[PDB]
C-alpha cells in the first residue's frame, strides 16, 4: 500500500511572488530539463504538435502561453507517471529534479485556468492507499481525477486492490479540452490542495473533503 498524508517531501511550489521571474527564466530551465531528461523532451515535442492543433479552437486566459498549453497537453500524455514520481520523491534527493521548468509551466497552467469553481470528482487507483492519520491530506503530486465515477471505476484506472477517492476539489481544473482523450472528463488537481476532512470507508474508498489552499513547503525554489 501507499501512504496518504500531507506529502511533506513533495515538490509543491506554488510560485507565490515569482511568476514574472519564472516566466523569464523557465524557458532556459526547460532547455536544462531536456538536456537531462530525454523522455520529457520527446513527450514535449510531441505535445507541442498537438497543442498547435488545439490552440486555434478557443481562447485561453490572459497570460496563458504556449508553454502552459504544451505542459498541460504533455501531462495528459505518457509523461505523467515519471513526472509525478520525480515530484513525490523530490525532497529525497533534490539534486536530480529534471522537471524544474515543466513543473512551473504545468503549475501555472492550472493556476491560470482555475476560476475557483469547486467540483465533486472521483479518482480510481490500482494501488491501495492507507491514510496515516496526519489530520489532513495533500496529494503532493499533480493528481488526475474524473467528473465521472464510471470513468474512475473503469478497469483502465481501478481494481479491487486499489482505492477509489471521492473528492471535493476547488483548485482542480476541468482539462477535457487539453487531453489526448478527452472523454475521461478529467479534472487535474494541484498537489498542494489540502483536504481538511479525511474519511476512509471500507477497504477501498477514501473521501476527501473540506479543500483549502494552504502555503506549500517550497516556494519559488528555482526562481
Ligand atoms: N485515476 C483516474 O481516475 C484518472 C482519471 S483521468 C487519468 C489519466 O491517467 C493517467 C495517469 O494519471 P495517474 O495520476 O494515475 C498517474 P500516477 O503518478 O498516480 O501513477 C500511479 C502510480 O505511481 C505510483 N504512485 C502514485 N502515487 C504514489 C504515492 N503517493 N506514493 C508512492 N507511489 C505512488 C504508484 O506506482 C502508482 O500506482 C493520465 O494520463 C491522466 O490523464 N486518471
**Residues 92/9, Cβ–Cβ less than 8 Å:** yes
**Residue nearest (by alpha carbon) to ligand 1 atom 38:** 127
Torsional class of 215: left (φ above 0), alpha (ψ -120 to 50), beta (otherwise): beta
Grid cell in block for residue 69: 498549453
Residue 89 annotated among the catalytic residues of the structure? no
Number of domains in the chain: 1
Resolution, expressed in angstroms to one decimal: 2.0
Torsional class of 185: left (φ above 0), alpha (ψ -120 to 50), beta (otherwise): left
**Residue nearest (by alpha carbon) to ligand 1 atom 36:** 127
Query: Does 108 show up as a binding residue in the annotation?
Result: no
CB neighbours of 49 closer than 8 A, spacing ≥ 6?
A: none
Question: What is the total residue count of the chain?
Answer: 223
Experimental method: X-ray
Grid cell in block for residue 201: 470507508
**Residues 131/198, Cβ–Cβ less than 8 Å:** yes
Rounded-to-integer distance, Cα 104 and Cα 195, Å: 23
Domain containing 17: what range?
A: 1-223
CATH number of domain containing 117: 3.90.176.10
**Residues 152/123, Cβ–Cβ less than 8 Å:** yes
Cα(199) to ligand 1 centroid in Å equals 20
- Please give the angle made by the CA atoms of 99, 177 and 193, to the nearest 5 degrees: 50
Pairing of strands 129-131, 2-4: parallel
Angle between helices 66-75 and 100-113 (to 10 degrees): 100
Residue 144 annotated among the catalytic residues of the structure? yes
Q: How far is CA 185 from the centre of its chain?
A: 15
User: Is the previous residue joined to 182 through a cis bond, with omega within 30 degrees of 0?
Assistant: yes
Grid cell in block for residue 175: 482539462
Pocket test for ligand 1, best of 127, 138, 149, 153 (most atoms within 8 A of CB): 127
Amino acid at each position: 500500500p501507499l501512504m496518504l498524508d500531507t506529502a511533506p517531501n513533495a515538490f509543491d511550489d506554488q510560485y507565490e511572488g515569482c511568476v514574472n521571474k519564472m516566466e523569464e527564466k523557465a524557458p532556459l530551465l526547460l532547455q536544462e530539463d531536456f538536456n537531462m531528461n530525454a523522455k520529457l523532451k520527446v513527450a514535449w515535442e510531441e505535445a507541442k504538435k498537438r497543442w498547435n492543433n488545439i490552440k486555434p479552437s478557443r481562447s485561453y486566459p490572459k497570460g496563458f502561453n504556449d508553454f502552459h498549453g504544451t505542459a498541460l497537453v504533455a501531462y495528459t500524455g505518457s509523461i505523467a507517471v515519471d513526472f509525478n514520481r520525480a515530484v513525490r520523491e523530490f525532497k529525497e534527493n533534490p539534486g536530480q529534479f529534471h522537471y524544474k521548468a515543466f513543473h512551473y509551466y504545468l503549475t501555472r497552467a492550472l493556476q491560470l485556468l482555475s476560476n475557483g469553481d469547486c467540483h465533486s470528482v472521483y479518482r480510481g487507483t490500482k494501488t491501495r492507499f492507507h491514510y496515516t492519520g496526519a489530520g489532513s491530506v495533500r496529494f503532493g503530486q499533480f493528481t488526475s481525477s474524473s467528473l465521472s465515477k464510471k470513468v474512475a471505476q473503469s478497469q483502465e484506472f481501478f481494481s479491487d486492490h486499489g482505492t477509489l477517492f471521492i473528492i471535493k476539489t476547488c483548485l482542480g481544473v476541468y482539462i477535457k479540452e487539453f487531453s489526448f482523450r478527452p472523454d475521461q472528463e478529467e479534472v487535474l488537481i494541484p498537489g498542494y490542495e489540502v483536504y481538511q476532512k479525511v474519511r476512509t470507508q471500507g477497504y477501498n474508498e477514501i473521501f476527501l473533503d473540506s479543500p483549502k489552499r494552504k502555503k506549500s513547503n517550497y516556494n519559488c525554489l528555482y526562481s
